[PDB]
A and B are shown apart, each in its own frame.
Chain A
Amino acid sequence: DVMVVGEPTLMGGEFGDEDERLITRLENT
């Protein structure tokens, strides 16, 4: 029942996981 404070999070940020796409940074030559 006694808790530890965590980091804040955005409200709808839980809900938009399916629509999230990952950006891959790549290298040349």
Chain B
Amino acid sequence: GCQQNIGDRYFLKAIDQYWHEDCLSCDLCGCRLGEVGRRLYYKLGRKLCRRDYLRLFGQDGLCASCDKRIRAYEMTMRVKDKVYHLECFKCAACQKHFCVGDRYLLINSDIVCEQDIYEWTKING
């Protein structure tokens, strides 16, 4: 970076170069890459944070529920081949959002919570 040796208790090593805590910054926004995430992105000769990397080079997808696009930086729920906007990952019956460890069934592209599988299938199929 500043091309000067640090002389402190803690320093960083990235892209076969040594850096300060303050010197290893994202080339686009200037955020401290060490405090923000344990990894940096290296594209077109630039050291980039995840956000700027994904906004610029990320791959978008299609939501299995709403059929609208999902931008690369959007939070998602991956289930087998399918991908959902986090807000679309909800039970088709009760419209309830889930918790880690909860049980749901995947029918086609429908997410139906466990409690609801019976009544939903009874009504819909």
The answer to the question of B64 belonging to the interface, with a C-beta cut-off of 8 Å to chain A, is no
Residue numbers in B under 8 Å from A26 (CB-CB)? 10-13, 18
* Known contacts A6-B100, A10-B74, A21-B40; A1 and B105 CB within 8 A of each other: yes
Contact of A16 among B54, B76, B100 (CB under 8 A): B54
Q: Which of A9, A10, A14, A15 has the most CB of B within 10 A?
A: A10
Q: Which residues of A contact B (CB under 8 A)?
A: 1-16, 19-29
Q: Which residues of B contact A (CB under 8 A)?
A: 6-15, 18, 24, 33-34, 37-43, 47, 50, 53-54, 57-61, 70-79, 83, 86, 89, 98-106, 114
Supplied contacts A21-B15, A28-B8, 5 more A-B pairs, CB within 8 Å: A5-B102, A5-B103, A11-B74, A15-B59, A19-B42
